[PDB]
């Protein structure tokens, strides 16, 4: 299976700052089939980005994705208090579907 | 006494090699969010608040354009009379119209046991041929729309930008950049361009597209002068939004198709302006 | 040859005998707040004919502008005088592609679908003249109580729902004459050329053409265009493109500006004074 | 001094035996999956994944074509037949007034549903096979054995990929959904097509023996018939037939051609 | 050497009484299933098996035709030459009756207009109209009183060149079986428009200012063999919907005014 790694493990930033989250794949993700999910404690995952850079229905424009092949980035342009939770990348370019281990964003 | 693009126009040159034809297939720029769905936009969002309207870049079809370089005709630039290429006619059509007869790939069934839903809904078919880049005027549905990075849209928009605001002037000088929903050809300019557009709006509008190699559009103005190719360059521009594709879910995506151009050009004598 | 109470002579043909004037004429759809310029207030429905009081901001009006032209006459005493003569008009509706915005505020066509296109009843009208456009009043409902700031048929009767020759107006004020009350008067407009198409219906698709290659001839059967009295050219328009549908199902008229480019020539006339 | 199809064009030969007329009824190729429903496609599938789209051969309408042999020519100059005019119409348009055979009732107690929906009406006349450009709805479509479709398709094949060039050189082989007449070629062919797409599009078809289409180009030269062969090509998908079940099948009709030709002097 | 219909064509005779006009009102043949509903078909059946498709005779609209006798003419032999036709559909305003028997459009609404598939066709010739057979369903069992493609095969659903007929009988050739044959009709001019669909609006024009020229490329109109002019029509306006939802074809008469001139001919 494709293995996804996420950096950093924990990102410490202030409200209003720019967050950059990294997802790296063990091999090239076919068709840039890379999704970004947000998870707030006690909730199902929430889709932000699909196809590496497509923003999902109803997601605020402060969320954007970029990258291709093995290197992918989620950008939160201006952090709101609700954004300080966990983020997972998902590859669906290869069966089985695999997630990264996650990145936590904490209030500095 | 013919002045056309700040230059005095003289007789049509009558030689053997005085006529030439150039051709181009111009690809559509519908947004292409997925590398497998080239010619399709990102699915359409609906019901954004006018105060909070932030369209995805790849959801916005853009105008296509290409600069076609031409042979230099002037051995010397000091001669009393100079030669310019003059666009006389264009043969143009949309390429791949029969691809919409694929009702098996991914289109919502029309009803139980039915075939897929044809592409249909709002369409725009536009082409231009000129000796300069196409000149455009900005008009917005919603002046408060927050357009995304990588689009060129009306700058410093106001409520007046929803009707006519003469501030919003652009050259079609970049591919996959000027969204179709923001820009129209400017009838107050384009002195050296001929443009042709039809908008058909509506939920269920049928696409109607004609192909023939027997049809020609004359590019000559009332004075018998076609676009004169400044710096030996011809500009072709297009937008061919054919309608909306409907996925099994009901999500809708713009489908666009390439436009072919064949431009007949002749040598026009002009007075040396310098 | 008499055109507008002045005897018409030869076309003057020197070097600077032709001129072009242009104008972008903005639509007057009602503009119900400062953000919704080019839209009407949402449409009320099912008013009693006996109690029909439309809001001013719900009523699209005819647009008009007077274009001042260069003085041609060294004096007004010479045997022959010069008048500007409108020969051709190039015109189109500006911003037709703005209706490809289906993300801002339009009701979804179905679950997961894009926004509903602007569609339904439309009116596309323009006039070019050397006098203000002359209009005839006709009402759907003679008992309609029109609001302050509108000019509408005065002392209307049941006959005002068909033809009442009392209802004569000049389009002499911008954003005042409601489109639903007034039409161009074919019994007058000797010095104006007008062109209008009404397409009525719930789901009528807007069809709009743009091209800088199309020209409308303004010359009459005698080869005489509108003669610009007091060196003034009048342009008039109504461009109701259809109805915009909000997520609630409420409908608003959407209008667009009209461009005019008018070619004028110097016409010799006999001095009337 | 006119070169048309790699040959210099000289004067038109005059007289009574300088003109000839050829005619053909060209049958439609809608798929014909059932020996009793000639002129119909297999029922339309719907909602295939773009990644797993394998249409049945007999579900895919194909372009119709025929090579019509002309009278043998060849005295001082070489002679070729030059196509001057074509009279053409769709044959059997009134058969769609049969609303009793197998079409879904429009409502309780109502007649059958008329044929309607997406239609394509196309014809070409040339001195060579029609030249075609490939464009696909879905580049990943797995086209079945017996079809000739764009080879080695890419994402670019959904817009313009100049690799996808074909001659319409086989009847009932080139699917209509894969191929269009190529405006970048067809120097020796005249083609005419109208596509009308949509769920409920009404078929609109005209017949008259008083209409003639001129095949002469800007230079006054018609298609020049290489190897004394005239090529006629057509696609006349009239719309969708709806069975009582709601299943839909393409209905096609034959196209008639009557081509007037004249003798043209030619030089290499 | 000008030949039109196996006869050598000479000069137009330029006399005083060298021009004549003939006219005919041609009634529609929609099936007329009862004597009170002339101009209507029997109600449409739906969803017959292709293998068991037996339409009722009075459900099938047929082509209308009439032979108009001309004045007998016979140095050179004379034939009447059809130069122009003025034609229109008669009684188009009768469809503004929305009170008689048409299903209400909705609760409290007026009756449903006639609408749906329509066919408007006319021909003028010096011979009977020549027709080609094409069938929706080759296995259709056509009833007694109809003339339909004989010995039909699967090929009869596309083009079968065996199916050739003369429109030589009024109220006999069903519209759904036959089209004008463009491979023949050298001595006839024909014009037809088919508009198919559930909700197609009838669109019909009337004016006494419109004329169709019947002269060919050589300037020769139909030559009236045996001093006979043939007029043919089909004017299916759409479907009438009864309160039950049953549908019937409505047809209307077609008027023809044909201008004829004396043409000198050999043989
Ligand atoms: Cl939201
Ligand atoms: Cl701007
Ligand atoms: Cl009044
Ligand atoms: Cl290929
Ligand atoms: Cl038979």
Curated annotation (Swiss-Prot), chain C:
Q: Name one GO biological process term.
A: virion attachment to host cell
Q: Which domain of life is it from?
A: Viruses
Q: Where in the cell is it found?
A: Virion; Host nucleus
The record's keywords, sorted A to Z, are: Capsid protein, Caveolin-mediated endocytosis of virus by host, Disulfide bond, Host nucleus, Host-virus interaction, Late protein, Phosphoprotein, T=7 icosahedral capsid protein, Viral attachment to host cell, Viral penetration into host cytoplasm, Virion, Virus endocytosis by host, Virus entry into host cell
An MF annotation (GO) of this entry: structural molecule activity
Q: Which residues form a coiled coil?
A: none
- Keyword Isomerase listed: no
Record's GO cellular component, any one?
A: host cell nucleus
Concerning its family, UniProt says: Belongs to the polyomaviruses coat protein VP1 family.
Domain comment?
A: A DNA-binding domain overlapping a bipartite nuclear localization signal is present in the N-terminal region of the protein and is required for efficient virus formation.
Q: How does it assemble?
A: Homomultimer; disulfide-linked. The virus capsid is composed of 72 icosahedral units, each one composed of five disulfide-linked copies of VP1. Interacts with minor capsid proteins VP2 and VP3.
> What is the recorded function of this protein according to its Swiss-Prot or TrEMBL entry?
Forms an icosahedral capsid with a T=7 symmetry and a 50 nm diameter. The capsid is composed of 72 pentamers linked to each other by disulfide bonds and associated with VP2 or VP3 proteins. Interacts with gangliosides GT1b and GD1b containing terminal alpha(2-8)-linked sialic acids on the cell surface to provide virion attachment to target cell. This attachment induces virion internalization predominantly through caveolin-mediated endocytosis and traffics to the endoplasmic reticulum.
Question: Under what name is this protein listed?
Answer: Major capsid protein VP1
Span of the full-length protein shown?
Answer: 28 to 300 of 362
Curated annotation (Swiss-Prot), chain D:
- Whether Metal-binding counts among this entry's keywords is no
Cell inner membrane among the record's keywords?
Answer: no
Where is it chiefly localized?
A: virion
Cellular component per GO?
host cell nucleus; T=7 icosahedral viral capsid
Q: Where found?
A: Virion; Host nucleus
Q: Which GO terms describe its biological process?
A: caveolin-mediated endocytosis of virus by host cell; virion attachment to host cell
Q: Which UniProt keywords are listed?
A: Capsid protein, Caveolin-mediated endocytosis of virus by host, Disulfide bond, Host nucleus, Host-virus interaction, Late protein, Phosphoprotein, T=7 icosahedral capsid protein, Viral attachment to host cell, Viral penetration into host cytoplasm, Virion, Virus endocytosis by host, Virus entry into host cell
Molecular function GO terms recorded: structural molecule activity
Task: Please give the function described in this protein's UniProt entry.
Answer: Forms an icosahedral capsid with a T=7 symmetry and a 50 nm diameter. The capsid is composed of 72 pentamers linked to each other by disulfide bonds and associated with VP2 or VP3 proteins. Interacts with gangliosides GT1b and GD1b containing terminal alpha(2-8)-linked sialic acids on the cell surface to provide virion attachment to target cell. This attachment induces virion internalization predominantly through caveolin-mediated endocytosis and traffics to the endoplasmic reticulum.
| Record note on quaternary structure | Homomultimer; disulfide-linked. The virus capsid is composed of 72 icosahedral units, each one composed of five disulfide-linked copies of VP1. Interacts with minor capsid proteins VP2 and VP3.
Q: Fill in the domain comment.
A: A DNA-binding domain overlapping a bipartite nuclear localization signal is present in the N-terminal region of the protein and is required for efficient virus formation.
Family listed? Belongs to the polyomaviruses coat protein VP1 family.
The protein depicted here goes by the name Major capsid protein VP1
Which source organism does the UniProt entry give?
A: BK polyomavirus
